């Protein structure tokens, strides 16, 4: 089987260097070049460069060039993408893809999330969306200023699935994300049944279960 | 230095029917012009090479046509797996553009969201921060714009939306919109309110609260 493996997601602070890799496999890596592709969160592609891996024969997009350093290992078929100092707009998934005569990438990796701020791991605070016309009411928990992704949020140990909507993060300004989670219950079921948002945060090892009340 | 232009931004159609989607390239070139697929979670992948040719193991609905700089690729009959974003790209020399990406999402009946807003609770704050939570739920199509007023005036700079993918049963999108301020910005004000213009909507809906009332 042809495939192109990259290395693990990375979490990095602006300023420091980081060289992530694509492993080929299943076909002779010195014949064809790979390129490096970017796609920052929301966005669509950017090509970034390309590299012959026979002779090292490397190509950069102008936005790139003199930002970036594609290089490869031929002996054990694995290009390479570095930074010397990232930036905070480097956040973003990197594909290493394979180029053909055909002028086409035939083959993906499946990518490497980069993920840069100046925030240091931190565990969320975890606020209610209280529930305060009509047989419907609205809850929730707002899960802020955690760090990195991901946050997992269940409603009461998850017995609650109906109606949840947990949104995307999105990374605030300070470089910390926020969501919000929320479910939409029967408002007559405020008096009689208890809420809660069981909010987990690997990174800092944090649990927080959070009873929200009207 | 080309530019390629996709057309239209988000295509909205149901599994069944048949997609037509359209690539126009600012330049005429002599490079090969490819199709590339990314489904939701996924790396992208090779559709089409050379504007008609199908990839290794794509199926026989998927084809492509064109020639000099406009390009199309249909779909004969959707299938849920098609639901995806869709990118051209065409070497200009040593330079590798892409399309800016079509959105194909499925097309259900307008439904107009359920609009609930949420005052800051008192724990937040206590920590000096005060973020107001609107939530639109269960609306189609996703366009939606959403205003905050404090005391009837315009609000700008100061919000964040988030958005959920198209719901796998009801394919309906939720969204969030947080306005953040200080606590000494947001006990300075009384009318909180968010703004809601959707297609669904006869007229634009208003949710508000006047700060510190049960």
């Known amino acids: 089987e042809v495939q192109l493996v990259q290395s693990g997601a990375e979490v990095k602070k602006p300023g420091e260097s980081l060289k992530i890799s694509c492993k080929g496999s299943?076909?002779?890596?010195?014949?064809?070049?790979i390129g490096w592709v970017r796609q920052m969160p929301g966005k669509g592609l950017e090509w970034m460069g390309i590299i012959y891996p026979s002779d090292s024969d490397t190509r950069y997009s102008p936005s790139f060039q003199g930002q970036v350093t594609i290089s490869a290992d031929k002996s054990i078929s694995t290009a390479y993408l570095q930074w010397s100092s990232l930036k905070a707009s480097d956040t973003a998934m990197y594909y290493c893809?394979?180029?053909?005569?055909?002028?086409?990438?035939?083959?993906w990796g499946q990518g490497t999330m980069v993920t840069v701020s100046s925030a240091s791991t931190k565990g969320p605070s975890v606020f209610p969306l209280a529930p305060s016309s009509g047989g419907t009411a609205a809850l929730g928990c707002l899960v802020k200023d955690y760090f990195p992704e991901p946050v997992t949020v269940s409603w009461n140990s998850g017995a609650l699935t109906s109606g949840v909507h947990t949104f995307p993060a999105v990374l605030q300004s300070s470089g910390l994300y926020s969501l919000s989670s929320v479910v939409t219950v029967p408002s007559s079921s405020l008096g009689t049944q208890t809420y809660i948002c069981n909010v987990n945060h690997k990174p800092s090892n944090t649990k927080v279960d959070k009873r929200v009340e009207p | 230095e080309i530019v390629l232009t996709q057309s239209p931004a988000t295509l909205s159609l149901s599994p069944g029917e048949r997609a037509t989607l359209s690539c126009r390239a600012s330049q005429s070139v002599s490079s090969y012009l490819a199709w590339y697929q990314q489904k939701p979670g996924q790396a992208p992948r090779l559709l089409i090479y050379?504007?008609?040719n199908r990839a290794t193991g794509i199926p026989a609905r998927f084809s492509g046509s064109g020639s000099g700089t406009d390009f199309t690729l249909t779909i004969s009959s959707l299938e849920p797996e098609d639901f995806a974003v869709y990118y051209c790209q065409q070497r200009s020399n040593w330079m590798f553009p892409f399309g800016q990406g079509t959105k194909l999402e499925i097309k259900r009946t307008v439904a107009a969201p359920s609009v609930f807003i949420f005052p800051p609770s008192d724990e937040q704050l206590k920590s000096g921060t005060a973020s107001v939570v609107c939530l639109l739920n269960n609306f189609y199509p996703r366009e939606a714009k959403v205003q905050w007023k404090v005391d009837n005036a315009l609000q700008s700079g100061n919000s964040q939306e988030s958005v959920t993918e198209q719901d796998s049963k009801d394919s309906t999108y939720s969204l969030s919109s947080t306005l953040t301020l200080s606590k000494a910005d947001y006990e300075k004000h009384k009318v909180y309110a968010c703004e809601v213009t959707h297609q669904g909507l006869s007229s634009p809906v208003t949710k508000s609260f006047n700060r510190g009332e049960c």
């Open positions: 299943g076909y002779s890596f010195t014949s064809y070049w």
């Open positions: 893809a394979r180029y053909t005569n055909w002028d086409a990438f035939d083959i």
């Open positions: 050379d504007a008609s």
